Structure formats: structure tokens, C-alpha cells
């Protein structure tokens, strides 16, 4: 298991999760569903995600990102985990 830090924990629970420990697969799953459900992705280039003025921007520390930058996204995710 991994333990999300406070802001990521809040984001995960906002999707409906209630627990404090997750597998990595669960963290990725709920984070992806958070973006999907909240319609944060660009309609035309759907790997672009808008983070400004959102919890997700608060915890990643960027205004936007591209899902194609795999190492960059995992780096932001792990900064918000205790593993």
C-alpha cells in the first residue's frame, strides 16, 4: 500500500473513496476518474489537463500538463505519496 498526503487524500476521497491507504493502481484509477468526471481535460487534445484554480493544481503545482509526459506525471504523483 501507499499513503496519499493530505491534498491528494482529499482529491481521492472527493471521487468517493473513504480509506487512507491505496495500491498505486487505485491511486492512478481514482486520479484519472477525478479528471474525467470533473471534465478537466481539453476536448480537442485530450491528453491536456487544466489544473488552474483546482485542487489538482494545488497539489501538482502546475497550471496544466500533458498526460503524454509519463515520467513528469508519475513524479508529481509520488511527491503527493508516502511510499
Amino acid at each position: 500500500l501507499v499513503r496519499p498526503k493530505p491534498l491528494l487524500l482529499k482529491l481521492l476521497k472527493s471521487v468517493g473513496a473513504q480509506k487512507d491507504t491505496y495500491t498505486m493502481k487505485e491511486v492512478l484509477f481514482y486520479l484519472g476518474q477525478y479528471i474525467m468526471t470533473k471534465r478537466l481535460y481539453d476536448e480537442k487534445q485530450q491528453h491536456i489537463v487544466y489544473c488552474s484554480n483546482d485542487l489538482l493544481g494545488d497539489l501538482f503545482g502546475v497550471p496544466s500538463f500533458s498526460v503524454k509526459e509519463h515520467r513528469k506525471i508519475y513524479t508529481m504523483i509520488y511527491r503527493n505519496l508516502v511510499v
Partner: peptide, 18 residues
């Protein structure tokens, strides 16, 4: 989901995790 040409956000997101 074709990781050579994702068209959708969740397919990009799946491809991130391979």
C-alpha cells in the same frame, strides 16, 4: 485503446500506466 493514437483522455491515462 491504441497507445500510438489515443483519442480520449482515459486512453491517454491508461497508456500512462503501461
Amino acid at each position: 485503446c491504441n497507445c500510438k493514437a489515443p483519442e480520449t483522455f482515459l486512453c491517454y491515462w491508461r497508456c500512462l500506466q503501461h
